[PDB]
Amino acid sequence: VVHILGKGFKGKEVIKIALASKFYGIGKTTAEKICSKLGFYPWMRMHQLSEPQIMSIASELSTMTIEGDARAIVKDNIALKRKIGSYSGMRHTLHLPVRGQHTRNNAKTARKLNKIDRRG
Amino acid sequence: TRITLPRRPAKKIQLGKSRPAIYHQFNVKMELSDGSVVIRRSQYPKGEIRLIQDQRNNPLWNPSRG
Amino acid sequence: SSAKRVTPGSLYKNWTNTTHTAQLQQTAVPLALPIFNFDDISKTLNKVVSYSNKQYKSLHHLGSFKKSQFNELFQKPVCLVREDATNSFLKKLVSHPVKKFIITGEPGVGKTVLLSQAHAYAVDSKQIIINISYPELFLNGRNDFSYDDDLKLFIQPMYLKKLIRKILKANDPALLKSIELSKDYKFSNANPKNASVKPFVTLNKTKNTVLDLLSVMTHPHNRGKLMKAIIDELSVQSKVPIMFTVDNFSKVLTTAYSAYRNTENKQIYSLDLQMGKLMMDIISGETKFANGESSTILAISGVDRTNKTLPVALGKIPVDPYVTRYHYEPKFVELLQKGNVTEFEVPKLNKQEVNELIDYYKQSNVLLDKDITGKKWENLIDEKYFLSGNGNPRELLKSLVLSHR
Amino acid sequence: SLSPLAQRVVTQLSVMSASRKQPKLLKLAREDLIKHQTIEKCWSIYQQQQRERRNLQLELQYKSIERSMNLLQELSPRLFEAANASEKGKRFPMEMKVPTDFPPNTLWHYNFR
RNA sequence: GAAAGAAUUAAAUUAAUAUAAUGGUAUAACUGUGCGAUAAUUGUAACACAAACGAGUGAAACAAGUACGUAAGUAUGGCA
RNA sequence: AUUGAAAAAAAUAAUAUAUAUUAUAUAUAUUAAUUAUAAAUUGAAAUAUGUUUAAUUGAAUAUAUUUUAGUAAUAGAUAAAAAUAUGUACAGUAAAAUUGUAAGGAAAACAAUAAUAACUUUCUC
RNA sequence: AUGACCCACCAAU
RNA sequence: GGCUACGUAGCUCAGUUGGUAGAGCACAUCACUCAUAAUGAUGGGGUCACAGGUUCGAAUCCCGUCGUAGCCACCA
RNA sequence: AAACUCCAUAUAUAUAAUUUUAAUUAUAUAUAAUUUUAUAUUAUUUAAUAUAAAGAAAGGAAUUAAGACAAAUCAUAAUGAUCCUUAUAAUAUGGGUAAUAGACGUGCUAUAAUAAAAUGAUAAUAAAAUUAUAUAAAAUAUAUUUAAUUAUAUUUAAUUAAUAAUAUAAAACAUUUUAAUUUUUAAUAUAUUUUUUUAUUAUAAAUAUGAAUUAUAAUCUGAAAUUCGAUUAUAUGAAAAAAGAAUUGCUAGUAAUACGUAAAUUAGUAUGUUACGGUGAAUAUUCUAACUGUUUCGCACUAAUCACUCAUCACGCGUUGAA
């Protein structure tokens, strides 16, 4: 609702999933019990968060791995084989089916996003 | 095109009457990553801050030691 | 225009809401109906009755009615004094040594009208009634929650406040002062008034009435004890009686594990939740009201999944050890059993009752001329009894207004 | 007249500006003025003394170094050469930190590397 | 020994100067500034310079008043 | 002048008040202000009087009354960005170039780029 | 099989 | 040879008395058709031929070279 | 052509010792309708339109002629002719058919409230189909804390079929939710809406839709998922705001369905194919246009109007004029 973890959110917005949305390092199940440990009554919106509570919220996300911090981990896992002899690396570097999909036709998607630092 | 704030007539500071800008500042305690506290004068109203990421927990500043 | 439903008329709400809240009654033609009273039941047997203004007041605070109920058809919610229900049933209550009954039945067969028939008894019968409707609203995981290691029970502040207000407002104020704290109580204080000055709150034992305890203003992690004591005061004392009234209990007769995850993602039982304890225990007999006029009516309703609990508990199916908890909470069974709980399978409507209702239904012209002119009378009568599965009050209505085929 | 952004800019400008934020001038009585002068002058003198002390100490250290290096040159040429090297890229160690106002939880680290 | 000041020499007129080009410029004409906004005033002008004449250029001074400056003073439009 | 706290004066300037002299003097008295000036349903806050708590203080709180807040740059005798080019008075020095420096690059802004003899003052062994 | 080509559409008595 | 106007999106023609990043036609891609072509609906291209210069801002402007019809015409 | 035919429908008989249980069925058979009877208008000896009255009365499928398109198949097979026999013939391993600038056709999933998702154990409700180149139930363990669901793993009960398994049909129905939506809440009080009301303060174009997509781990099948399969969990969450000119299917149990179901081909994977059922419509015949059969008139065409045909220009080459 405020500047929670910088890119915050809005009120009325039940927190549970809200975290799955703005945050990239956390989503779905992770965000679910993330509230559980912080014990906030489920179906609870952002406006209701008692600022001090957000503080715990913040620390919690620090504990596990969130934000583009992991974007890189994959970026490296990508570069890894890519740096080795890896069909993927070609598929990924050229912007082509890294999942071996329809290069011949439906491949624009790959060309659109698949790239060295994919998640852009 | 150019976005501006259009100036009013400037107020004449007379020679000798110019006064130095002493901004309102609070004495603020910074507790670093470890428990070392340091006092610093600051314009924002907060008597105490505790920091998470500092030189005292960065590897570059101490190589030997959501 | 720019404001939502800027137009005074509000229908944007899901129609079931449009029916619930819209102040549409208004137009309803005023009908001079007889008043529901149990002492005068012989005069009003098998007739449509209006509740007393005092009865309505308590019923409204207790939320005795429901949105689904076609209560909008009339200037106020009405009922029939059915004899297999009102008359015969209320007699059990004013006569059974256990005063612990469960109003079951087939969906719509008005297992709820009855319960409200029962809060009707309590208004005049001058008791204290503590309905806990839509339990779900506390097992939903939507309202607030926090622990209370002075009771090992997760408590639900906000929810408790709603129930506490319901009991205090619906019940007659005088009928309340009559119970004076049977001891001591010392909790928080946040009454905007004497708050930053009086640190805590105090209730002297005999200068303070239960009405007062039920008017305190505590901080979240306190309302819980307020309830422990609220109940406890009323509970132990013997001056006026009680009617722990629970509708939709089914939901809590089955869906144990609530919605609120605890602190290890583990699910919180419906018994570690305070109101669950306040709700079941009394049912079981772990909590006793002194006054022999203690009354307890719990009642399952339709909007709710079914499972082996009730049937087995009540003895309508031998215990099957090898089943599944998702459909047989062995405990809930035990509680009921050790409580000697009895069932008033609400019976459907007889042909003449049908006529009756349909007669009243004619008055306010809450019908449809496809059958008012062009049909004799007996014709229709037999018809609705038929297009109503031979007895689901709601179907009659579903078949006499909603359906314009 | 003005946008919300324009308003916020004006507010920001005001924070920095001396417009209607500054007090009256610090007027003193003559006795008070004298007392102030005596406070300031004494302080200044003390500061000068401290500077001289430090400066003197530094000079003494320099003299001692000079005395040492001449002796080293006289005795062992190789040792003197080793001493007198260009220390161009010499960096203070990152453990020698600027002393804080109050000390940390762990005052001293006994283990390292 | 140190600080601080006052500065002094060198270098510079390549910057700049209302505008060409030259001449002058740091002793600053150039730049900042306070005040002011008056001398971008009013009568007699000697005397030169230039010069065929008509014209033009500098201008002591006498007198009336204005401005700024502690003062010396300076100011009869602008570095020419 | 009136309250706090617990005989007078004596520079300088300024203001106040007076009076001497074909002398912008003196005499007594006191040390104001020094970044401001209308116009603000609502923002903020002070005082005076209305209810509960220990006559009674504090709290809340209501009405009047006002005060604040109209938020705005220069704080420097400023100094080579743009602004006025005539007067006067005071004060200072530019440009280029090179080593640099988030984006910044040939080309933004910013910083640094001669010499200390002597002289004085202050501390000091 | 002989056998690479086809070109025009305008609105009523 | 200084010396008047013209050097545009593939083609033609723009724009004018500044308040600028146009037109069709051709082309690519659909569709229409049995298949063309018309017709229809979709995208492509201006260094508005080069230097330097101005008002807040010139395709425009000033300011003249690498370019387009040229300049001889007091003879006895 | 029609009719017989097959499914399907009405009745009737026979069979089933009602434990293969569905007797509301399954078949074998028989009859039945290409419906009939009567009156009244019209017409001209007896048809049509209305009305009643008797019956259950209603559909689908298969069959698509002769010819033509020198339509498709020499890769189902087969065969003539012609071409090779140390290679255009046979085998193993690996690779390929999965490559992608653009373009087309067909689907799937989509873009949220006259619509999507959890949940419903006295399991609301089906037909058709499979299962000796097998289906694989109950449980049991994990993913995960209860339990259910979902997906795998352990062991194989029963059934080789009106017996047991795939498989509790799902949609509908009910309740709960649901961005934008300030249409919300949550703190107060407010009260004859209580799951609600009202007064005040707060709550700054892709969402909780969409799952393309990207990592990591895990599981199936088989020697072997790397080019190259499937599944799930944790992550990721592009595009997509009902889509231009233009165009497709469908006239009744049809279309539509965010309704599921089965089989064949699989060691293994269906967004495809072939079948089954559930819910279940509006709109219509009056115009043009197109395709067909019947007919008029015309017809210079006849591999037939996608015919045929005309003049100039341009190319090359004869002959014969003017001068």
XYZ file of C-alpha atoms (C1' of nucleotides) in Angstrom, chain H residues 13 19 25-26 28 30 33-34 38 40-43 46-47 52-53 56 58 61-62 64-65 69-70 72 74:
27
model
C 4.150 17.307 -57.771
C 4.643 28.484 -36.436
C 1.080 6.420 -58.874
C 4.123 2.834 -58.864
C 5.526 -5.239 -50.899
C -3.682 -9.439 -47.818
C -11.769 -13.601 -58.916
C -11.724 -19.874 -61.853
C -9.196 -2.922 -62.037
C -11.069 -2.431 -51.807
C -7.806 -2.261 -46.747
C -2.560 -2.238 -45.037
C 2.877 -0.733 -44.479
C 12.154 12.313 -47.378
C 18.938 13.558 -44.318
C 28.475 27.194 -41.901
C 24.612 31.524 -39.173
C 11.691 30.813 -28.696
C 13.435 28.142 -40.533
C 15.975 31.455 -43.336
C 20.662 34.069 -44.133
C 28.185 31.021 -51.334
C 31.010 26.232 -53.559
C 18.134 27.317 -69.396
C 22.670 31.208 -69.545
C 29.130 38.182 -76.121
C 28.397 50.773 -80.051
